[PDB]
Write a protein that binds this ligand. Sequence first.
Ligand SMILES: NC(=O)c1ccc[n+]([C@@H]2O[C@H](COP(=O)([O-])OP(=O)(O)OC[C@H]3O[C@@H](n4cnc5c(N)ncnc54)[C@H](OP(=O)(O)O)[C@@H]3O)[C@@H](O)[C@H]2O)c1
Ligand SMILES: NC(=O)c1ccc[n+]([C@@H]2O[C@H](COP(=O)([O-])OP(=O)(O)OC[C@H]3O[C@@H](n4cnc5c(N)ncnc54)[C@H](OP(=O)(O)O)[C@@H]3O)[C@@H](O)[C@H]2O)c1
Lengths: 658, 658
Amino acid sequence: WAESLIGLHLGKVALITGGSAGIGGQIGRLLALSGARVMLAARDRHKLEQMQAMIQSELAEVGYTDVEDRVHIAPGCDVSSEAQLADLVERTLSAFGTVDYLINNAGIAGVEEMVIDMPVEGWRHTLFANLISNYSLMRKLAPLMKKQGSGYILNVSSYFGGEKDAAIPYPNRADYAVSKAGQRAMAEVFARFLGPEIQINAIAPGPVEGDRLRGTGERPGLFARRARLILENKRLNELHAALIAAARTDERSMHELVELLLPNDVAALEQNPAAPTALRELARRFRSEGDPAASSSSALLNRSIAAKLLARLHNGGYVLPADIFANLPNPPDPFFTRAQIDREARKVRDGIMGMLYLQRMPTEFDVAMATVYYLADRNVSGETFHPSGGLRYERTPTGGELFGLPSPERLAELVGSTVYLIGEHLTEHLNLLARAYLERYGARQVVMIVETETGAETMRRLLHDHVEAGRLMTIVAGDQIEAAIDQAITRYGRPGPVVCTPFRPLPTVPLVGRKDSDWSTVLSEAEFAELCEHQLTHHFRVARKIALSDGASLALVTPETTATSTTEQFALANFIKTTLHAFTATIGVESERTAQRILINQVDLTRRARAEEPRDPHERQQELERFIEAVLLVTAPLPPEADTRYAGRIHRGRAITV
Amino acid sequence: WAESLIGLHLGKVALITGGSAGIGGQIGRLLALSGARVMLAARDRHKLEQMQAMIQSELAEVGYTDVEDRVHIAPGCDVSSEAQLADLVERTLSAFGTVDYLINNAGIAGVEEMVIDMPVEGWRHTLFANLISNYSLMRKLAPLMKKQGSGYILNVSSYFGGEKDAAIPYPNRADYAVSKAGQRAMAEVFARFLGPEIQINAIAPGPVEGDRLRGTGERPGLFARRARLILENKRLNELHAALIAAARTDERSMHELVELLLPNDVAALEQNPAAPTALRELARRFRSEGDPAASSSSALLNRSIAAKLLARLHNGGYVLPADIFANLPNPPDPFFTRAQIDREARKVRDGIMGMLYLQRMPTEFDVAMATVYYLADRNVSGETFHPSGGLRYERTPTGGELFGLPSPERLAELVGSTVYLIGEHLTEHLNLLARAYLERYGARQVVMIVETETGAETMRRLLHDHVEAGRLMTIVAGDQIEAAIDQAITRYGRPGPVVCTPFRPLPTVPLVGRKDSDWSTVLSEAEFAELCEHQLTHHFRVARKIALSDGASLALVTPETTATSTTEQFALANFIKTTLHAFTATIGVESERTAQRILINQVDLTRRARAEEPRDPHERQQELERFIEAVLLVTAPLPPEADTRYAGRIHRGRAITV
Ligand SMILES: NC(=O)c1ccc[n+]([C@@H]2O[C@H](COP(=O)([O-])OP(=O)(O)OC[C@H]3O[C@@H](n4cnc5c(N)ncnc54)[C@H](OP(=O)(O)O)[C@@H]3O)[C@@H](O)[C@H]2O)c1
Ligand SMILES: NC(=O)c1ccc[n+]([C@@H]2O[C@H](COP(=O)([O-])OP(=O)(O)OC[C@H]3O[C@@H](n4cnc5c(N)ncnc54)[C@H](OP(=O)(O)O)[C@@H]3O)[C@@H](O)[C@H]2O)c1
């Protein structure tokens, strides 16, 4: 089976992150069998030692000699740590000299929570381990590759990282999906810069067969554990959505509404004539869809679900005592029956197996083999190879440019509205949006949330008339956007429409260095992390907070490219646009599937090429008018009757290009 | 170099169309070296005999025996002929038994003309040779593959066939681009049906190095020949656009306007105070951009360009004597200087080489090698593999669903308009569109162009009020849509907005047969040709005629999928949607780059999955209202001041999903 592999990569030096197990282990194994010297990097020394021993044994079996010199390991290497990545490169260059192939394989599953339950530090951790790490290793190794005249960077993405012009929603995995899309976007935008000496591509396998206790989750190993978590999550989502909906149209405070849940009695809530319709209707559903042997059919929640619900409400600025659930009656086991858990487990498994046209999942070996053959191809860069595929799954096309204004019915819903605008750099855009909502669409007030006092003063001067009239209020958020939103909620009221633009512009540093240079001025590992913080994490933090705070709509705006932008700015802008599309699509579907009203969409001020950009003042005025139209199209709320299943799916998770 | 190849496909039987030369020859060669028995099919026996001899010699050199039994040829096989395809399969099965790998490689460059210069029979020929042939061979071979439990269909598409969710415009190659996109779309939609026994994928290489006198044109061999044709085409386009524009706002007939060109004198046209501004401005440009040593700088045209211009005008319903150019002064050679031709030739070459990130084109051998390694992958279906890539080129994302109505400024341009609606099956859509344009937007008249008397009567009864009032006229086109449009032009006037819907619904036959069946009821080769005629060629014929006839706008409407449509109908609909996107994108860019006013876009009534479709009367009314909004968004003409370079590119070549 190895006859076509032996010799294919003879003389090459490869570094494989996550090379002690899974797909990375198989890629390391097959590259070694192909004749490459390999450095396997991971955290656990024992597993690395086992993998090294197995590969060295197989190398000896096929005739290699001095096998100890062909397979090295780098234990203690957590790819989320910049220091460990620097040490990894020092160790690898000391052992083998210049690296020919960088296999950015390491990937963690991540937080595995919906965005509104996702800790901000957890999201950052996923980006560091799965995406920023890929740039860091490229930044350290590409200089030597360019000097020698040849190199290869392979980022191991996923089918769920999307594809060119199509986002793939991955509910409960936004952090992971964004990391995977960024890996592909990096290959797509860096190819022109790294050529002709260096190839950069991504692989995007679908679900792969592997250890049930490991993996990135495309294949769920423990379907039953996954099933129970889905059921606990569903109870939380149903209770949270009904409470948020009820509070929007009830005179009772969220505190008073949560008090209705304290008896923890489904039938009592359903039969309470003074209970909000949303909560009575939910109670009926719990009884109808429930298993009489499960306590979840007679009890609303348990301590675990209650704590997670309380966190959602507190994180949305709702005022409730921390001990509100201290005396919650504890429902008797089982809360969910083995029958309910087993049925959901079958649903999860059949859902995944049913995506496969070939009705079989590839093995890690199969994926590694296709990948090692692919690496021999010297005529591909900026591409995403699917070693496994044939999947029935939902895609959300991105990049549409032909659109108009929303219906007068949606526009009428803006009258008397409280609008939140977030930004700093795009002063003209923020001014025009504030005036549009206030002067043309009758919003009661606009809260301008900026990063700095200088930004606040700039906007206050641009909107002096509305400031003097009490219609434009300014808040300075700094690096505390959640606390700034809490200030807005308490003093000005919860938001209806929200527009989120980036505080910062894109950097203008080089993305690659001259062949015989030290690359001292090239985008740094820290600068790349900063780009992700200002252009991805910024939007995530706002989306998470606004969704938890019951905002009506949210437009995520990407950085602006102009006919004057640097070629590097165009590259970074397109990187952000593609990567954020993964976030927008994922949170749009999460929100739709969980009965959240919030409409989340993306408005792109970035374009693929300068030739498409406005070249004169007429074209510029056309562009700024399209920007306002695009924002209005995604932010004007749907008259509640129109939020059909059909229309609701259309108005969520989409991206349009101005 | 063949060590990793020998043994990879041992035991397999492969059929390679276009296997005497080019990429197909290399695929046949490497599959044979890999251990497969191969049938090479093409037209010329001599070239097939040479290729067979070369491969047999190489097989003997590497140790194969009885090489005459491992490489067969099928001369006289024009893939555009169904009869020859049937004979090819009989010959192949007689020689080797069941085919494991069908390599649909054969591809012709096609007409190589803009749509408005493209003979309808030339387009049909390209579809037969490059696309329908692929279905025909699959229809004959897939039954045996499914019976044996294994098979592989590989369609050799092109990067210019687009990708999932993105059309790639290929100006002057619409027939080719559509054929290439169809090859990929076939793999994408048939994968679920052919699995799990059969894999179907496409390869989409970018430009490949090869014989300058051959190839599909991604790499132009004779840059200079290509350059001269570009210059002759540019003269035709500039003259045609100015004449069409002038006739729209001048009292003179096209006959009288063409008379201004008969002295064949650029300076005289520029200096004529009574000449239309468009023609005087063109004459100035010919002088400014011209080479004084070229007769093209002092003369407007030559007999060749004049004949091609006259054909355009006649094909657009303009009335002119056939001998109008009989006494045209013949400009002295050179019409275009070697300097002008050489500069354009450098532009063509640098344009192609500049698309490459790796600054080198792959060889046919390189592409074949990557392809033969790819064929070993058993975990991919419905995918498009890029054996070569890394290209800077324009893409037009498709599949956007979030849009609204056009501006009141565009809508005002419909008042007093002459609208052409084309269709038969979608009676409700045609009725609602006619009433929208007539009752809400003030169109003067709607010409309803249907296929049959039964369709005409159905529409006349649905629109009885407008018929009685002289605002709805009906024409029966049958299979003569061009002649029907000519009738509309002569009796009712040239069209402003035009909506083109398919006359026919999609078929409901099976797309694959049961394993132990004869597949007698499965979509036939003839039925697949008929699908292309009714769902692709229909739109091409209308777009070509409407563009030549100076229509203002044109909406190409794809077939309708409903929550009730068969799974097979969803597959065929998505096949058409993807394939037509290639046409819409290509003709939109051709029109924009050639100064044609016509706005051509696509409105999709097809969706990827039934779950996205309306499920109740409320959702259905939302859908039909979105349909009218989508059509209005692409058909309301641009106030001429607004047709900036920026806005013009946005409003052409786009597709939206209702
Ligand atoms: N599994 C799938 O179905 C699938 C599908 C598509 C894409 N992918 C992608 O394929 C790649 C590998 O996935 P997999 O399923 O093989 O994962 P896996 O089985 O969890 O891979 C584990 C390997 O990664 C190492 N690792 C884990 N966390 C690490 C960290 N923070 N730093 C460094 N090394 C770390 C492990 O050793 P230590 O634990 O000792 O560190 C071990 O070597 C990922 O990028 C993933 O997104 C997987
Ligand atoms: N060339 C490129 O840069 C490029 C790039 C992307 C994709 N492609 C695709 O690759 C495939 C092969 O292209 P190529 O450049 O190799 O073409 P090519 O050099 O013209 O290939 C010629 C081969 O096709 C045969 N052939 C030509 N017309 C035929 C017909 N009507 N029926 C049957 N066989 C016919 C020729 O023999 P006879 O003339 O005797 O029939 C010969 O065997 C096509 O599908 C093409 O679209 C090519």
